[PDB]
Every structure is written in C-alpha cells, then in structure tokens.
Coordinates of C-alpha atoms in Angstrom, one line a residue:
X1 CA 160.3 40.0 231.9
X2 CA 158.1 39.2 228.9
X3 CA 154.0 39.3 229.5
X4 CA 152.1 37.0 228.0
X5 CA 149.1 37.3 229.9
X6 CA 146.5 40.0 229.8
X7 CA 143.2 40.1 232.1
X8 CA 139.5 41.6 231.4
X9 CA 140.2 43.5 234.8
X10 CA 143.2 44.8 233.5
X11 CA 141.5 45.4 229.8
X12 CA 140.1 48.8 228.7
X13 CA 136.4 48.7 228.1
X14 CA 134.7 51.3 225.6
X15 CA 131.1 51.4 223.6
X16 CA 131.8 51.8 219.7
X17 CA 128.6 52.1 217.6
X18 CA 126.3 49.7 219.9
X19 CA 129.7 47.3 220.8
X20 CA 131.1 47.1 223.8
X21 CA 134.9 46.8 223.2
X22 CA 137.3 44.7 225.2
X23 CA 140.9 45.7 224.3
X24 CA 143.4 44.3 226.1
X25 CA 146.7 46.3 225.8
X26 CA 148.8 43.5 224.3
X27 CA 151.0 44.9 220.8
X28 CA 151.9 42.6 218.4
X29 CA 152.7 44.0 215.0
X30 CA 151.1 40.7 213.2
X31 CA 147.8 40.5 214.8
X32 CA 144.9 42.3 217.4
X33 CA 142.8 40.1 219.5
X34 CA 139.5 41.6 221.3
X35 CA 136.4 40.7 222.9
X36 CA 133.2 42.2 221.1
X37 CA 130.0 42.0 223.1
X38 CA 127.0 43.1 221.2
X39 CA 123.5 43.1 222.2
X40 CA 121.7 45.0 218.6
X41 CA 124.3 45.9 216.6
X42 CA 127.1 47.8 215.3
X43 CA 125.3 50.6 214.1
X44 CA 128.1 51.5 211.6
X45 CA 129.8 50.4 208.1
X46 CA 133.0 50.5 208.0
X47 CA 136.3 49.0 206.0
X48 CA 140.0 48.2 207.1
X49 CA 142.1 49.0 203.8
X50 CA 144.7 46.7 205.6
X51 CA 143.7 43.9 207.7
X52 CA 141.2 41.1 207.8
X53 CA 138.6 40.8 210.5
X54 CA 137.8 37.2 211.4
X55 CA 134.5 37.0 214.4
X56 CA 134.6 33.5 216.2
X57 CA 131.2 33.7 217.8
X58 CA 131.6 32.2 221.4
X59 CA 127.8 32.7 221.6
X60 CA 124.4 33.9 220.5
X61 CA 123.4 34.7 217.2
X62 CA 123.3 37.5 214.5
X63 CA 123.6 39.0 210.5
X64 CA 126.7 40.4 209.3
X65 CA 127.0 42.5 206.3
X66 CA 129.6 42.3 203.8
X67 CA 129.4 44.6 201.2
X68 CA 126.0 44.7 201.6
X69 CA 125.7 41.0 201.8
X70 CA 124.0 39.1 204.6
X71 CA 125.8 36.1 206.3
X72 CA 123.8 34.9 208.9
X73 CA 125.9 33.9 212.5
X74 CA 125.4 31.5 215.1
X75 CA 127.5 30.3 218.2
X76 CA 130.8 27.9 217.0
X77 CA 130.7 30.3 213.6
X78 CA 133.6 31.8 211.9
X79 CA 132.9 34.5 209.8
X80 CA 136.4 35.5 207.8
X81 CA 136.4 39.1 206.4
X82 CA 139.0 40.3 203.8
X83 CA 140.4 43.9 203.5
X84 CA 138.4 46.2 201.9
X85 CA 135.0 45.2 202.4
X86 CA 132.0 47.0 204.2
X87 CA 131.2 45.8 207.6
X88 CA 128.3 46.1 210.0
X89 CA 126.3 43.6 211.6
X90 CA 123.3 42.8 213.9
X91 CA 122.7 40.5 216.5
X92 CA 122.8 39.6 220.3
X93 CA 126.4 37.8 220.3
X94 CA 129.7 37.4 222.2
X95 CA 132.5 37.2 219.9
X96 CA 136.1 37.1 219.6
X97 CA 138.0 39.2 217.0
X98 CA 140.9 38.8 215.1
X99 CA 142.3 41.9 213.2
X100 CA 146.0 41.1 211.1
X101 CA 147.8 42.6 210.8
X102 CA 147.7 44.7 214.2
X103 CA 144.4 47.3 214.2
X104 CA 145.5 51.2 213.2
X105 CA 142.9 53.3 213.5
X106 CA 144.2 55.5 210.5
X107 CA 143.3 52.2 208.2
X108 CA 139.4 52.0 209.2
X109 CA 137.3 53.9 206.9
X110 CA 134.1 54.9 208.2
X111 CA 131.2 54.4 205.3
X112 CA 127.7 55.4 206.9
X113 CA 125.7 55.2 210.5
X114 CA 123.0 52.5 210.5
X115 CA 119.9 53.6 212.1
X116 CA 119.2 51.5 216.0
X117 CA 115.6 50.8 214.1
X118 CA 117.4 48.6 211.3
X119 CA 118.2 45.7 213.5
X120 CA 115.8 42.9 214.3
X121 CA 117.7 42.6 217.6

C-alpha cells in the first residue's frame, strides 16, 4: 500500500528563476528532496524562515551566495545552508536538494531578482 518509490517520468518539472525543478510528489513532514538542474543561475535571493537547504552537487561546478557571501561549488560538494539566510547562486551544475523540514511555500521569502548578466556562467 505504501510508496516508497517515486520516478523522474512520474515527477513534475517546472523552471524557477533560471532552475529547472524536479519535484517528485513524495510528502514527508520532516524533509523535501528534489533535483535542481541549473545551467547560469538562480536568478533570485531568497530565505526559508524554517528549513535548511543542503545542495549535494552530483556534478559541474558553481558560486553560491550566502548572505552575500561566496562559497565556491564543485562536483562531490556539500554546501549546508541554515534558516534565514540569503540564497542565490551561479553555475552550470546538477544537484540534489534537501529542504527540512518539508518545503512550504508560505516560508520562502523572496529578497531581490539577480540580473541573467551577473553570472559568469
């Protein structure tokens, strides 16, 4: 009766600020799992009052920004965000994303756009 197992064809895909967004459909009140492709950037800050946002980087290579701070990325990585801090990031990567607990929209809090021109991507 239970699932356990969730499938890319069976995912919904969408484009968020640059990303495309594999979300899987699974709920589990303690943590969200997704696939973030990027190929430039997120081209938007943001913070989660809430959860942590932890980006294993399967592959490629990128610059996040946290709180206005750059940590560099590269494939293996694991870049560990705490609630409450400022988020965007450049790069040409495939990562997966942690977000615990589970992702609500209502606790991202949109800061400001980054212009397409600001990444070295």
């Amino acid at each position: 009766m239970t699932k356990y197992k969730y499938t890319v064809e069976e995912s919904e895909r969408f484009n968020k600020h640059g990303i495309d967004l594999t979300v899987y459909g699974q709920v589990d009140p303690s943590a969200t799992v997704v696939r973030v492709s990027v190929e430039r950037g997120h081209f938007q800050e943001f913070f989660n009052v809430r959860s942590s946002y932890t980006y294993y980087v399967v592959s490629g290579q990128g610059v996040f920004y946290l709180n206005s701070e750059a940590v560099p990325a590269g494939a293996t990585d694991l870049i560990t965000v705490p609630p409450n801090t400022r988020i965007h990031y450049f790069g040409s990567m495939e990562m997966v994303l942690t977000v615990a607990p589970a992702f609500n929209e209502q606790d991202e809090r949109h800061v400001r756009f980054i212009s397409e021109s600001e990444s070295p991507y």
